[PDB]
């Protein structure tokens, strides 16, 4: 069935560095961008909400101001990845990635930041 997959379910990053969390979803020939929906939610935050090729920033949590970004060019490959720049200690925690292209599925990624 439709299944979202993560290459790494645990990331160890360290402070003040730019990190990327990868999420892979099935794409066959050409990506139909209209059909694509991408949610990056860590816990009760919302990081990225992506529908019809637009980001709704009204629902993004303020912790992520001009910090988090979804990499677009990887999407055509069936890779929807989130890039948090300048990772702080509070960025450690469980991230969820929900995708709908055709069907829909989600996944969980735990991120540990280690201290200087």
């Amino acid at each position, epitope marked *: *069935a*439709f299944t979202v997959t993560v290459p790494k379910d645990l990331y160890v990053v360290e402070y003040g560095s730019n990190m990327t969390i990868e999420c892979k979803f099935p794409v066959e020939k050409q990506l*139909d961008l*209209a*059909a694509l*929906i991408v*949610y990056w939610e860590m816990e009760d935050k919302n990081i990225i909400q992506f*529908v*019809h090729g637009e980001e709704d920033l009204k629902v993004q949590h303020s912790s992520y101001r001009q910090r988090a970004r979804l990499l677009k060019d990887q999407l055509s490959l069936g890779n929807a990845a989130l890039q948090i720049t300048d990772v702080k200690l509070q960025d450690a925690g469980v991230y969820r990635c*929900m995708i*709908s292209y*055709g*069907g*829909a*599925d*989600y996944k969980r990624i735990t991120v540990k930041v280690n201290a200087p």
Partner: antibody
Amino acid sequence: VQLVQSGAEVKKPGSSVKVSCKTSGDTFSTYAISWVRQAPGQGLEWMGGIIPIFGKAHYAQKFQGRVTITADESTSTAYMELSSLRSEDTAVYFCARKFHFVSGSPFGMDVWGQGTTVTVSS
Amino acid sequence: EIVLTQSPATLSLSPGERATLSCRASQSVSSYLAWYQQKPGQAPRLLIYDASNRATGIPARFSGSGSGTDFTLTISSLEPEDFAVYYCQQRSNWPTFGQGTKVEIKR
């Protein structure tokens, strides 16, 4: 895949109404269902839609306030609640699902419920 | 909102004649479009999907075409059971319908 709605209802102004929709078909939790209002002698209107596992609905800016869309994955039943009923809310309310092959938006409507008629009068 | 303008409002023809229903979009919807046939008292039924592709179970007398802003639905020979309103729907963004075109039997 099939859709079945709740029967027709008469509600007096300012009250609230909740319409039921059940999927006898393909997966429920995986695919988006939408709710559409067809006003008398009028065009169809996309109100909102939800993909049940996501657990939060999307609404049109016209219906932003009064509409509440909730998906029960347990029953594979969808609901649409219209708060603060008035007058011209009287319409034929549909729930619809996309065919997996038609592409475009996940909220596209192809398979429809038989329709729910709502009358608002004193 | 993308706005769909169907034309004409009322098409009046008779059995055996061809029919032409137009839909324009206020923006580019590319090829994401679908035509529906709604008889009174009933829910819409998909005729043409992806703007050129006819759904199975639907007569070969039905066809649609176009991409970007200009689309047309065409009925080769009007069947008595073809008379009804015909709506259209764009999926390139949040779905919007047209006003629909009502086909009347001309006698």
